[PDB]
């Protein structure tokens, strides 16, 4: 469907030295943030009225407790083993865990961890899978973790039982926001491109939601497959910005248009027309 299909929590833990570590965390629907983690309190910040989904306050409180205990205990245990794993401070650990709804209805779950910006481990079904980039440290880590009683069982429940019903309940609870349609603005600009007698045309597209969007430079019905898309960049208000560029010979820019397709436009494409062969006459 239209809006996000995945729920996931992310962790960033920075270890400055043997006694000081800081952890940031948050919860997301695709790239939409719906939870913050407040290290002031060890509780979750609900960013939308519907951010608890269909979960009761009791179950939310239990999950907050599990996360609060995990975050405090993770850093402790890492510090304790930092020598055994030949770790040099400072270092930084990342993790992401959640589940995603696919076409056809299956919900796939995942957990991945990184050290130093490189893959370190993943989980497949309460099994810790060391990543090859993590080397022997990751092999040693996965052999250690399976000995902490009950932690793989907690992970398995959260990944495979708790997350899928959370995801469904929160996508339903949030639908007024998550399935809204916001129409983009579009405008044109131009610039010199690197190379003789060349010229860069830019089609800007801004303020659309949901994220899938189609934008191409055109000559009539002919899609200009030399079109190059930038990154899709966020705005604050759950929309995005995107530019599509075309390198064109000076004197060949006439006849070009930019065409935008988006689910919000109900079939009425945006068409901006470039006028003049060069810069702007």
């Amino acid at each position: 469907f239209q809006g996000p299909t995945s729920f996931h929590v992310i962790q960033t833990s920075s270890f400055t030295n043997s006694t000081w570590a800081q952890t940031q965390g948050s919860g997301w629907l695709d790239d939409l943030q719906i939870h913050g983690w407040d290290s002031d309190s060890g509780t979750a910040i609900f960013l939308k009225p519907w951010s608890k989904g269909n979960f009761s306050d009791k179950e939310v409180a239990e999950l907050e407790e599990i996360f609060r205990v995990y975050i405090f205990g993770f850093a402790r245990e890492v510090q304790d083993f930092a020598g055994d794993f030949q770790m040099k401070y400072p270092f930084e650990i990342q993790g992401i865990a959640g589940c995603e709804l696919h076409s056809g209805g299956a919900i796939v779950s995942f957990l991945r961890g990184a050290l130093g910006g490189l893959d370190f481990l993943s989980v497949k079904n309460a099994s810790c899978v060391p990543s090859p980039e993590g080397g022997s440290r990751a092999q040693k880590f996965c052999a250690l973790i399976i000995q902490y009683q009950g932690i793989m069982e907690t992970v398995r429940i959260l990944l495979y039982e708790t997350c899928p019903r959370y995801l469904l309940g929160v996508l339903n609870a949030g639908k007024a926001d998550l399935q809204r349609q916001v129409k983009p603005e579009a405008w044109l600009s131009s610039g010199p491109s690197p190379g003789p007698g060349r010229l860069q045309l830019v089609c800007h597209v801004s303020g659309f939601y949901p994220k899938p969007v189609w934008v191409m430079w055109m000559r009539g019905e002919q899609e200009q497959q030399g079109t190059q898309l930038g990154d899709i960049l966020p705005n604050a208000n759950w929309t995005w910005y995107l530019r599509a560029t075309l390198d064109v010979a000076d004197g060949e820019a006439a006849g070009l248009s930019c065409r935008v397709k988006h689910s919000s436009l109900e079939g009425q494409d945006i068409i901006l027309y470039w006028r003049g062969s060069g810069l702007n006459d």
Binding site: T12, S26, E92, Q94, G117, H204, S206, D231, N235, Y241
Partner: protein, 98 residues
């Protein structure tokens, strides 16, 4: 493991019309480690009414943040994003180009 320098993209919410209020976004992405400092700048002076997103990261574990401020472009004013990071000896300045 690895260290990656921030990509810095500055862009306005709406097309830049002189005199018309707007929003100025600075998107700092692709960096590692997470430690970073960012300021939005009006004519070289740090804008003080600046909001930013919580830390996130992409598929390759690189971090990204959005900074943004309402502004009113003029033909005479200059706006920029200033970033410092362990991969930068001096804070890098990326000026907004409408």
């Amino acid at each position: 493991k690895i260290q990656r320098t921030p990509k810095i993209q500055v862009y306005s919410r709406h097309p830049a019309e002189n005199g018309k209020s707007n929003f100025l976004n600075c998107y700092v992405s692709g960096f590692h480690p997470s430690d970073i400092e960012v300021d939005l700048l009006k004519n070289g002076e740090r804008i003080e009414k600046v909001e930013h997103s919580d830390l996130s990261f992409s598929k390759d574990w690189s971090f990204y943040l959005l900074y943004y401020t309402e502004f009113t472009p003029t033909e005479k004013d200059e706006y920029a994003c200033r970033v410092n990071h362990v991969t930068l000896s001096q804070p890098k300045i990326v000026k907004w180009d409408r």
